[PDB]
C-alpha cells in the first residue's frame, strides 16, 4: 500500500477540510441526497416522534481530490475517513431530540475524478404531528427533512438521489418490517426556497398505516 500512502500524502498536502470545494469563487457544490430505510423502529404517539434507522446516501464532487490513476499504480478509488475530507453539513432539520448528525462517520469513497460518495448510518428521531382523529385505524404522514445547516442555496445545491427513483430505498430481503405499521408511500422531494440565506430541502415522506389487530382484540 505504499502507492496508496504516497497518493494519500499528495492528496492531503495543502488540503483544508473546512473549506467548501468550489472550483472557482461563486461556484456551487451539487449534493445529491438519498435515503435507505433499514428499520422503521417506531412511531411514539405520546412523544409524537418517529424513530428510524437509515443509511444516508450523499454524493458530491470535490475537485481537490482528483488524481490520474496512471501516475499512482492504477489506483482508481480510495476509502478515506470522513473527518479527513470536507463534508456537506447535511442534517435532519426536523429532529425531535436535538440530535442533528449521523450515528457513525464511517468512511467516504473517493473516485479519481473527485467524485465522493458517503453512506453513513443514522438513528433518527424525527418530529411527526399525529393525526389522532381515527386512531387506532389511522394513517400518519411522517417527514424527514434533510438540508444543509449552514450553507445557502448559492453555495450547496441539493438534489434527490436517483441513478433511479425519487423514493426512500427499501431492500426487500433485508428490511426489518414493523409489526405495527405498513408503508403505503415513500416518496422524496426537493423543496426549493420561495422565489441570500435561502436554503433548499430534501424531504423523505413516509405515509404509514397502523395495523390495529391489537386494539380490535383488546
Amino acid at each position, epitope marked *: 500500500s505504499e502507492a496508496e500512502g504516497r497518493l494519500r500524502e499528495k492528496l492531503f498536502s495543502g488540503y483544508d477540510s473546512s473549506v467548501r470545494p468550489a472550483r472557482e469563487v461563486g*461556484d456551487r457544490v451539487r449534493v445529491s441526497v438519498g435515503l435507505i430505510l433499514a428499520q422503521l423502529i417506531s412511531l411514539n404517539e405520546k412523544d409524537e416522534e418517529m424513530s428510524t434507522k437509515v443509511y444516508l446516501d450523499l454524493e458530491w464532487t470535490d475537485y481537490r*481530490l482528483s488524481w*490520474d490513476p*496512471a501516475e*499512482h499504480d492504477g489506483i482508481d478509488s480510495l476509502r478515506i475517513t470522513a473527518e479527513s475530507v470536507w463534508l456537506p453539513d447535511v442534517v435532519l432539520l426536523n429532529n425531535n431530540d436535538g440530535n442533528f448528525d449521523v450515528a457513525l462517520d464511517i468512511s467516504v469513497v473517493v473516485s479519481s475524478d473527485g467524485s465522493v460518495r458517503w453512506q453513513p448510518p443514522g438513528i433518527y428521531r424525527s418530529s411527526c404531528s399525529i393525526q389522532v382523529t381515527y386512531f387506532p385505524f389511522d394513517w400518519q404522514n411522517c417527514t424527514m427533512v434533510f438540508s444543509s445547516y449552514s450553507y445557502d442555496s448559492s453555495e450547496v445545491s441539493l438534489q434527490t438521489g436517483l441513478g433511479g427513483h425519487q423514493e426512500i430505498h427499501i431492500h426487500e430481503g433485508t428490511f426489518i418490517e414493523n409489526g405495527q405499521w405498513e408503508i403505503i408511500h415513500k416518496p422524496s422531494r426537493l423543496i426549493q426556497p420561495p422565489g441570500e440565506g435561502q436554503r433548499q430541502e430534501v424531504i423523505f415522506y413516509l405515509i404509514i398505516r397502523r395495523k390495529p389487530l391489537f386494539y380490535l382484540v383488546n
Partner: antibody, heavy 124, light 107 residues
Framework: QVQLQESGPRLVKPSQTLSLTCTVSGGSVTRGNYYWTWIRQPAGKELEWIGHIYISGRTNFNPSLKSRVSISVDTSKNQFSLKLTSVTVADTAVYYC????????????????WGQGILVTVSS | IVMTQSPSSLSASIGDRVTITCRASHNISRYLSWFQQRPGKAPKLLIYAASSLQSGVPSRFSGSGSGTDYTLTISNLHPEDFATYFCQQSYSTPLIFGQGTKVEIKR
C-alpha cells in the same frame, strides 16, 4: 467506460441557429471534475475549441465566437447542448463533443474521450 | 497563447524516425497533448501531460519537453503511422490546437 454521441440537424441555413446535442452514456454530466467541451474542425484546417461547460453550470467560450455561442447542460437526459446563432458559410465543420478531465494532484488536464463527430454544413 | 507546430509537413519511410516540435508563446506547465488524426476520422489522443502515454497506444510514440518547448518522437515508424499530428495546450482557456503536421510515405 463513458461514451459521447453527437446529434442534431446535418444541414442548417445561414443566419439561423445551429443546434447540437451531445448525449453521455456511462457517466453523469454533473458528477466528477470534468469540463464538457465543444470543438470544431472545418474540413482541411485546424481544430477550433468552441467552448465548455463545467459541472457546476459555469461556461467558458472562445473569444472569437463569444457573442454567438451558448452551451447548456440537461441533467435529466444526461446531455449537453451547443447553440450558435447567426451562422455563416464559414461555420461549416465537423463538430466534436468531448470530456476534458482535470486532476489536481498530478496537475493535468486532457481531453478524453472524444465524440465520433457530426458534419454540419451551412447552406441555403 | 499561440502554438507554433513545426514542420508543417514531413516525409518519412517505414522504419525511420519522426520528430515534431510544438513551441508555445507562453510558459506551459506541461499542459500539452499530442493527437493523431487519420483522414476522415476523429482526432485520437496519443500523449497527454507532455510525457504520459495514453492507454492502447504503441510505446514507439514518445512525448517530451517542458516550459515552452515540446517534442513528439515516432521511432521505428509503421505503415499505420502516416497521419496528421496535432499539439493541443490546456494551460489556459481558450484551448489552442497546433497547425497540424502531416507525415506521409517518402518515395
Amino acid at each position: 467506460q463513458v461514451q459521447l454521441q453527437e446529434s442534431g440537424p446535418r444541414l442548417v441555413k445561414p443566419s439561423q441557429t445551429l443546434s447540437l446535442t451531445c448525449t453521455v452514456s456511462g457517466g453523469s454530466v454533473t458528477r466528477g471534475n470534468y469540463y464538457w467541451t465543444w470543438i470544431r474542425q472545418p474540413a482541411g484546417k485546424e481544430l477550433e475549441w468552441i467552448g465548455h461547460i463545467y459541472i457546476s453550470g459555469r461556461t467558458n467560450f472562445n473569444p472569437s465566437l463569444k457573442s454567438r455561442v451558448s452551451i447548456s447542460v440537461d441533467t435529466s437526459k444526461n446531455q449537453f447542448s451547443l447553440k450558435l446563432t447567426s451562422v455563416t458559410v464559414a461555420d461549416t465543420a465537423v463538430y466534436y463533443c468531448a470530456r476534458e478531465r482535470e486532476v489536481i494532484v498530478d496537475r493535468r488536464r486532457w481531453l478524453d474521450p472524444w465524440g465520433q463527430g457530426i458534419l454540419v454544413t451551412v447552406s441555403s | 497563447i499561440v502554438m507554433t507546430q513545426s514542420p508543417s509537413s514531413l516525409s518519412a519511410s517505414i522504419g525511420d524516425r519522426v520528430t515534431i516540435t510544438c513551441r508555445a508563446s507562453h510558459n506551459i506547465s506541461r499542459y500539452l497533448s499530442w493527437f493523431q488524426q487519420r483522414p476522415g476520422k476523429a482526432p485520437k489522443l496519443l500523449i497527454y501531460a507532455a510525457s504520459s502515454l495514453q492507454s492502447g497506444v504503441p510505446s514507439r510514440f514518445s512525448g517530451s519537453g517542458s516550459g515552452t518547448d515540446y517534442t513528439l518522437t515516432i521511432s521505428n515508424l509503421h505503415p499505420e503511422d502516416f497521419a496528421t499530428y496535432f499539439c493541443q495546450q490546456s494551460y489556459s482557456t481558450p484551448l489552442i490546437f497546433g497547425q497540424g503536421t502531416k507525415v506521409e510515405i517518402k518515395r
